Amino acid sequence: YEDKINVGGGLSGDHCKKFGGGKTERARKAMAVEDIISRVRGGSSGWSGG
């Protein structure tokens, strides 16, 4: 504003903020159990085992 005497004024304001977050988790598991048993009382010296 200026009248009989001059007066000067000036102001400025600016602010900026940016936040960020990122997370990712991955997991994988697997289990398999296979057992085979064979008992033969056949009566041959070789063929029973064969």
């Binding site: 289990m31 398999a32 159990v33 296979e34 048993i37 064979s38 033969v40 009382r41 010296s45």
Partner: protein, 49 residues
């Protein structure tokens, strides 16, 4: 090996009529008895982590 004699026999022959084919063996008097039970087996197993 054998630490003793296994061929000696005491008296009347003891028959050993058993086996795959038709053949007659002898059992020594030192051995009480021998059988021809031919058992057989095998196993298998798997696992994963």
């Amino acid at each position: 090996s054998t630490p003793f004699d296994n061929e000696f026999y005491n008296g009347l022959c003891n028959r050993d009529r058993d086996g795959n084919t038709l053949t007659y063996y002898r059992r020594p008097w030192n051995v009480a008895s021998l059988i021809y039970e031919t058992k057989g087996e095998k196993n298998f197993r798997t696992e994963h982590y």
